Amino acid sequence: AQVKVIFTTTEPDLELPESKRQLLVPADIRRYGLSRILNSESMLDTGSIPFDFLINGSFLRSSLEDYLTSNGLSLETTLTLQYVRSLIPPVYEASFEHDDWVSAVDVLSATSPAGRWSSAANSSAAVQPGQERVLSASYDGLLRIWNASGSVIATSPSGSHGGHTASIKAAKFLTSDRLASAGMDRTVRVWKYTESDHFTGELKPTLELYGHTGSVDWLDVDGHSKHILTASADGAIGFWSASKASAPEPDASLLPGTSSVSTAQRGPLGLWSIHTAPATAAIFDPRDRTVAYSASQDHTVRTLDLTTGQVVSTLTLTHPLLSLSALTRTTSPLLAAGTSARHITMVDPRATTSVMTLRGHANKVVSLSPSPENEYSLVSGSHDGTCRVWDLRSVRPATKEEGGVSEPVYVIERESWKRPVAGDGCKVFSVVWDKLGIFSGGEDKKVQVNRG
């Protein structure tokens, strides 16, 4: 009793040219056997790689002919088997304790965007494997630069000293030299960051940017072309320069009129109200740097040309959108939209039907971030106090409410604490996925680190 099988794959660097051809023993045959077959000298000659397998968009957890047995399928027929690199489970490692809620988390690494930006053309240092930094924004009104080992190198200036005058909603590394943040003071602040031989840093605010009337809830950066874009509760998306060199003069009716020291106050080089409701998310396009994507509570994802003020496309979903992230995958991306309805809608902005829905979060999905390695995968994080890891190659036809649906591959809880009702104490505000990996800040006043 043997069964013939055909391997297929979406993995770029792993393929068998003619060798998709094999006949196999389906006796106590599972993920394990097949995986050690793919790793064999005869096939991929990798030899160590954990694999998983998808038949028609579904993981095989059972014996292969128990599979064809249950479905009533005949023995002799061939089963085409997709194989994917199995995700190494991100168990718990470290925690960085803050005084208040952690609103934002970002990572400076060699493979992180700011690292790749700072490496090229320099005017900054390519970060060494030894030195990684983790930025954390807090409701304190304090930015903090953290060691990879989880110590505080530097904290942003107080209060009156030029720091934020309110809570900080979002922050990012635009480059190893310069970092940007935004908050409830309606300002977008740009910081210069230098570090001493002994480990202590300094964050000196370079720029105070007032374009917004409202809270700035979202911030995205481009370190190459030196640009920031922001999503605010006014329903507007700001587009900013981080350089004092080219910046417009501020409105001056948005200005405070404390006062220890004066840093240059400037305005946005663009500002656009495209939204009926508060704008939840704004991101650059992964490839074309002049294209941006907005998400809002008005159910819309808008493709927005940064060259003009134009909005070149609008896409309307069934619920308000609390977050947005772009995955590469084709010269246009595939968007992921975090919802108030607890789902994640996968959206193609290109010329509306939804590709698939990521289901199983118990609350609002406030943050997303794509995998650094295999990019059919992505991590989400949500107000239910959890961060969930998805594989888009996993898909099932919808049942009661419609299509196609993906359930989570892995679930990351808060080790601080059954899982508390609503978001009580545990809410996850921000998640970033690096190859250090899966840093998640939130309401429990800490940044959690998960990696394998």
Binding site: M184, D185, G214, S215, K364, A422, G423, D424, K427
Partner: protein
């Protein structure tokens, strides 16, 4: 359901830090903020989605009601504490120097059935610009759609109970004095310039034009806890300590179109969802809110359709008492409840 939808299903967010029961909840006109009056005598403003408390003030001795000025031109919050009404401007990200100045000039414009005064020193430092004093303790507060007129109801107030206030002249007056009993609460009409006053027995409706009675409706309950008016204006909904909820169609009859008992305890609050959606909820002394879908086809000739969509639990019954209040988000189908937990809860 087939199509009913949205409706609130689960509680996504909890608001904490009120010691003692939360007496009232009000969602911002622009829907990014929540107001809660406390039994601790504090007014608190919160970021709606996160549950973060961005502001608080101690007026002082309990805050019975909180209501926003229903205009996006302002961001002005009204509170009722004891016998005083406090008009204030919460410190918020939404408040810029421009909007602050605007609201400040709305309150300062216009510079005894009521006594209007600056609350003085510490209170005006924290953003409370006005205090209006009446002579009996204030239960209810309602705003007119355009936000110039607001009514305050003081049940023990004898006949100065229902008072109408003009923010322009700083003018308190007590018209249509004349009722059948104790006044629980009042409401302005959404479209026409009418006025509703609910007593324990019945709900009377007056025209501000002729300053006299238009139509009186009988819910048929022993004691009216509260009511609310449909945006259409043709319908309203009443609720009672009799555990029953009554839909009143003002076109078809002056006595209830429908009666519903979903609760084993008194219903303390009833609210329609303003701004377009066929949702209305009622709050009970058991920790449950009951969510109904109901629809006015606004072409008449057919009766409105009422079905319950949900029962939202998870409020803790604390010292003999359940949920004390409800409010709806302006656009989205989210509701927020104020219970005796000392918590406010967000439901989606």
């Amino acid at each position: 359901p087939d199509e009913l939808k949205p409706f609130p299903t689960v509680q996504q967010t909890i608001f904490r830090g009120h010691e003692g029961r939360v007496r009232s909840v009000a969602i911002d006109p622009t829907g990014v903020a929540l107001a809660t009056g406390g039994d601790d005598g504090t007014v608190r403003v919160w970021e709606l989605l996160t549950g973060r408390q961005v502001w608080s003030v101690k007026l002082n001795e309990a805050v019975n009601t909180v209501r926003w000025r229903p205009t996006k031109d302002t961001f002005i919050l009204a509170a009722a504490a004891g016998e005083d009404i406090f008009l204030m401007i919460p410190t918020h990200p939404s408040v810029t120097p421009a909007l602050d100045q605007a609201s400040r000039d709305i309150l300062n414009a216009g510079f005894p059935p009521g006594k209007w005064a600056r609350p003085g020193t510490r209170l005006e430092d924290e953003g409370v610009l006005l205090r209006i004093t009446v002579r009996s303790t204030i239960k209810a507060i309602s705003w007119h759609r355009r936000g110039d007129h607001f009514a305050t109801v003081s049940p023990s107030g004898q006949r100065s109970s229902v008072a109408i206030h003009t923010l322009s002249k700083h003018l308190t007056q007590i018209p249509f004095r004349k009722l059948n009993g104790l006044a629980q609460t009042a409401s302005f009409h959404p479209l026409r310039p009418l006025f509703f006053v609910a007593t324990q027995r019945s709900i009377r409706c007056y025209d501000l034009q002729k300053l006299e009675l238009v139509k009186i409706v009988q819910p048929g309950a022993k004691w009216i806890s509260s009511f609310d008016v449909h945006p259409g204006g043709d319908n309203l909904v009443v609720g009672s300590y009799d555990k029953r909820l009554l839909w009143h169609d003002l076109d078809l009859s002056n006595r209830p179109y429908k009666t519903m008992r979903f609760h084993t305890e008194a219903i303390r609050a009833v609210r329609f969802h303003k701004g377009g959606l066929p949702l209305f909820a009622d709050a009970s002394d058991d920790g449950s809110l009951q969510i109904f879908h109901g629809k006015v086809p606004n072409d008449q000739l057919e009766n409105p359709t009422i079905v319950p969509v949900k029962m939202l639990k998870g409020h803790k019954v604390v010292n003999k008492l359940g949920v004390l209040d409800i409010d709806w988000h302006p656009r989205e189908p989210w509701c927020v409840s104020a219970g005796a937990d000392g918590t406010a809860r967000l439901w989606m």
